[PDB]
């Protein structure tokens, strides 16, 4: 690092983009698997 010294702006923009655009909300099969591994 000392000698050498996607992109940051692109990544933060992409972060805001995902957060504003999509609402992820799991499916029932995933919920049941999580139930089993939760117990």
Partner 1 sequence: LTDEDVKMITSLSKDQQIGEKIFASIAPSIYGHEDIKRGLALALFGGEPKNPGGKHKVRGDINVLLCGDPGTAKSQFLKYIEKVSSRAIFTTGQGASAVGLTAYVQRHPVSREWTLEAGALVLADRGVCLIDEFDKMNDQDRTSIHEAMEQQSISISKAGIVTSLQARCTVIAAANPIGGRYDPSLTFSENVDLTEPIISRFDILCVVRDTVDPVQDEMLARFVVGSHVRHHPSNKPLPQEVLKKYIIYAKERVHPKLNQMDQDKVAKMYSDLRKESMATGSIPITVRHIESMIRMAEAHARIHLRDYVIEDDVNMAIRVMLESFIDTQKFSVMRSMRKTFARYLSF
Question: Site residues (CB under 8 A) for partner 1?
Answer: 1-5, 8-9
- State which residue, 3 or 26, has the beta carbon closest to partner 1: 3
DSSP tag of 23:
-
- State which residue, 1 or 28, has the beta carbon closest to partner 1: 1
Q: How far is the CB of 4 from partner 1 (least distance, A)?
A: 6
Helix, strand, coil: what percent of the chain each, to 5? 65, 0, 35
| Closest to 14 in 3D by CA, of 23, 4, 6, 25 | 6
- State which residue, 5 or 26, has the beta carbon closest to partner 1: 5
């Amino acid at each position: 690092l000392h000698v050498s010294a996607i992109d940051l702006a692109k990544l933060k923009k992409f972060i805001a983009y995902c957060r504003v655009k999509c609402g992820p909300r799991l499916s029932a099969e995933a919920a049941e698997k999580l139930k089993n591994r939760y117990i």
